[PDB]
Amino acid sequence: RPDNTAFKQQRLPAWQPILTAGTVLPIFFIIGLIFIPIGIGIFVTSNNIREIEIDYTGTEPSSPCNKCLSPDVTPCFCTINFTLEKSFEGNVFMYYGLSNFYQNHRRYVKSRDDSQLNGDSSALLNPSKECEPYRRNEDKPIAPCGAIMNSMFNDTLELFLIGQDSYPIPIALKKKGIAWWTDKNVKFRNPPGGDNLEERFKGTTKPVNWLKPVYMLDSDPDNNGFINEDFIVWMRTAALPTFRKLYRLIERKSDLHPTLPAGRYWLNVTYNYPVHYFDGRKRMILSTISWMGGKNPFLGIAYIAVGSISFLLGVVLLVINHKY
Amino acid sequence: TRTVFVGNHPVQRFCDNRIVSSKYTLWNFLPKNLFEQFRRIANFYFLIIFLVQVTVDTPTSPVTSGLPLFFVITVTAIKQGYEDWLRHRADNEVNKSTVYIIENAKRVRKESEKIKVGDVVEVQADETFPCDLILLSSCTTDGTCYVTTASLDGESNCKTHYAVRDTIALCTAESIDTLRAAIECEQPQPDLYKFVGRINIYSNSLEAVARSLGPENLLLKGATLKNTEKIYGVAVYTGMETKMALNYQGKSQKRSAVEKSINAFLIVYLFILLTKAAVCTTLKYVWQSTPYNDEPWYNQKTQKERETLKVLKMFTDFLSFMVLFNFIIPVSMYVTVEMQKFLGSFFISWDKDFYDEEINEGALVNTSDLNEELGQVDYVFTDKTGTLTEKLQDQAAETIEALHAAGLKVWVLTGDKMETAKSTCYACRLFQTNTELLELTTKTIEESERKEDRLHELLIEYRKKLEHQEYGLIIDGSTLSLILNSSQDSSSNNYKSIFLQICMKCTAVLCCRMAPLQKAQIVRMVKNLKGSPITLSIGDGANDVSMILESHVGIGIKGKEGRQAARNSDYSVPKFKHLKKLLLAHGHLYYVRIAHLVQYFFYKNLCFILPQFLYQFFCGFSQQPLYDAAYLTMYNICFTSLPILAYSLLEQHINIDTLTSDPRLYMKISGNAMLQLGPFLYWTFLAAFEGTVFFFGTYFLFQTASLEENGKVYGNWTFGTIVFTVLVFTVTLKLALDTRFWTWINHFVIWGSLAFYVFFSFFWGGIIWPFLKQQRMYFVFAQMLSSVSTWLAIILLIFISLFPEILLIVLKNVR
Ligand SMILES: CCCCCCCCCCCCCCCCCC(=O)OC[C@H](COP(=O)(O)OC[C@H](N)C(=O)O)OC(=O)CCCCCCCCCCCCCCCCC
Ligand SMILES: *[C@@H]1O[C@H](CO)[C@@H](O)[C@H](O)[C@H]1NC(C)=O
Ligand SMILES: *[C@@H]1O[C@H](CO)[C@@H](O)[C@H](O)[C@H]1NC(C)=O
């Protein structure tokens, strides 16, 4: 009368593993002998990464950019002499870092219209209400609406290597390739209508803090608006109040010459972005990469620390059972 | 002290023969149930958080807080409304019966619920009585009557009652002669063997006959009449006052030990949630005291958040921090304990070992809400005739040993007389040869204050100075009435304490000649003493319905008497021996499956929300969710919902073929061990330790300016997608280290829930739909996976996190 089925009788076939000290303690050695080599591998690699940061915020009269903390006739320029000790050979990546800048604030992270930036004609002319109070200006919809956009970083940094004489020679920095391939070719599109861009943004208005509309960010027709890599890079919020956004790409030379030879350099910056109002700091990061990215000791030191704390507890309790 | 006129004829304030076993009216069921439910702290909190999400601010959606709270109400009101409607259906078959009454010189026929005190009822042979009668006569002479009280004392022998002498001649012969009489009785009491009254039969001209009335004339209610063609009574107690209706006590409600823990864990996580929200709100306004910490020229409040009253936003921010951290009290734990209880209860019905070819039936689950209470029993209150004896049953002595080996105390509460009631226990292995009987029967206390001496001669000088195997108590319904009822006279040395101690220090107790309610007053004395012993009562009669309703879990045998106790119990086995497999195997499994689902549901959500609470110190305490609204929503629904539901439905903590062979394994889970303060602080610190490795393990990983060989930076949806991948793999592998019984369903759900979080993350992220107002997670999971330093940071954090669980194993497995 009662269904004598394996499932119903609670008698299915099972595996029933029995893990025990005598079975797990060899696992504390497989970890130690795999995490220490990896830890030293990615700890030596993070040490072969050359880098330099030039804080150019001012805030100390002993700095060149103190003339740009509160200017009067200001298109503002700086010049921050810095020197490279050891050459940079591989690919180099110029960044810009902002500190005390809350790109992850809740009222901030959402102040955007993902459909407007996706080339939607319906949303391009009536932006969302999350992007407020940056939703309309002089009774027109702002072209890129939102606070995330309005506060785009707009400093211009250019490096100069000073040759054997005093003549400074410029370095070639390329703007293309700094934003996720996916959020420039897919997630960020231009308005669909036409081939001329100034007429796709007709019933729109440039953001309040902008100085040139979003169809004037670049002259290159593939880097012109809503697909600009500088724009697309600032739109990807930071996740912490101290962040870095990719700025340029100094590419390795065809010859095996050093990408950035050693010597004295010039960081010419046009000081546009104000950050002292909220006790912020601006810096420039020049760095090389590896299979693991930038220079971060945490991941190496964390594989050693955990590969040694695990290879010891294995030995600790392995002999404690050798008491027999 | 109540005056009854026999024929309602003169020489009021009485009930009317209507038993009411139900609790709800079929008109006011919703107002009274929705108040008994939303008066709990769990059901009332879920409704207060759902109202805030709908009114103030919600991180994901209000539909995911009101839908599970509505399923959990609607489902508990159907159980409670059907389990109660079944009592209406039973009250009707006892009322609305046929009962012939002699109204006016003829044989009227009303229904049982329409009888009134003082009217000559007539009962034929084998007809239950409609009320507590007073035998007036019999068709045949000798003024006798053979009653069988199998629903009052559970026995089935032919009792004998005697009709009033002066009225034994009235046999359908002018029984309606305006028969002058006045039955002066005592107020209704539950004694079931005491009745003091007086009748005043009057004569043709004038009479003074006053014949004393005793329990030999009172024909109680629910006692079939035997070997007698017809009798004639006089309803004296009718409805809710019959001695059978005074020994009921009703059913209040039964909560498990696990559901009383779920309520303690919810009041601990209710203060963890009010501290997370009150610490983040105090810090949020200490951080905003700096003018450039709010409105720092790059995000500014529009005009409505600059004008909102200062004190109205402090209270609204507090509610926004509670709607953000509200996930630490999971609404899905109650949605899953319902599915688990209803689905898991099918293994008792399906069991082929709970099958009797005699009755051609098996086990039966009347309430799936006590599955986990079958594995926490401390006391077992039995019944002698029908449950233990049929001579003893098949294995009534081998089951009482397996109940002592497991650490339970088996008492036998009976209604038979101590002569034969005692002989059996000597065969059930419950009373050994070298066991001294400490008896409190009426054949030992023939005095007023004598037993007060006995309770001392047996406690303060005989048993508590010492040997746990030697003394066994015996009591009586006559004596227990003096100890239980008369315990409000002395308070310096109370009888109920001096006597309760003698019971816990005795091997076994046996109470003879118990009334249906005294079985429920003994089972309630145990429920009170020295903590909270979990009691179980098993009986096959209708007199056992009052202790089956009073205990923590009541088992009703399906036997010769009827299905009166089988339908008032929580479970029903057609045998006594089926109690060993029911609580040793089924009870052990049912408890460990639900006590781990409760520990794991609270842990699994503190690992989830702790990273999101720490994140506030790095935003402006702005209530910015660390994860995407599609991850917040699917964590408890899709990514972590199935693995623990298949653990709760098929997981032999110990092989069940071994759980029945070794009863000693029952004591390992005996005091709610798995849900104590020890195991609770381990799970709560594992979750607070892991939740700190998740966030701070990736906080340091994000100090590099890039994690790719192309030098591209990650945003804040990748920061939270890395904390969520380490979290889903850690809480899923923590349950794979806890699993000891791997069926093909456990591989499918555990490794399928992981392969689905990855397949879904590629599906949800990788397309622009469009039906969303945002495209924030478009390619976040795909880019995060193109970096080798992120695969390693995830492999290292779901190892540092699972270290205290792998290390604790090697400790719990050596020396
Ligand atoms: C006679 C008596 C009758 C008694 C009948 C009882 C029988 C019950 C039958 C079962 C019916 C189930 C109906 C479920 C209704 C649930 C409602 C629902 O889904 O809402 C969503 C809930 C949400 O939970 P929460 O996230 O912790 O809370 C959110 C948080 N409080 C907030 O702020 O908002 O989420 C949850 O409550 C989670 C629920 C558990 C989900 C388990 C089912 C999984 C569904 C399938 C998922 C697919 C996943 C695929 C994985 C691959 C595996 C191979
Ligand atoms: C770069 O550096 C020097 C620093 O004074 C500045 O004078 C020079 O004009 C700058 N070059 C250009 C092209 O602006
Ligand atoms: C640069 O940005 C700042 C702040 O957004 C603004 O005040 C300034 O006008 C901008 N200058 C430009 C766009 O050249």
Ligand code: ALF
């Ligand atoms: F035999 Al009983 F209660 F004593 F059913």
Ligand SMILES: [Mg+2]
């Ligand atoms: Mg019985």
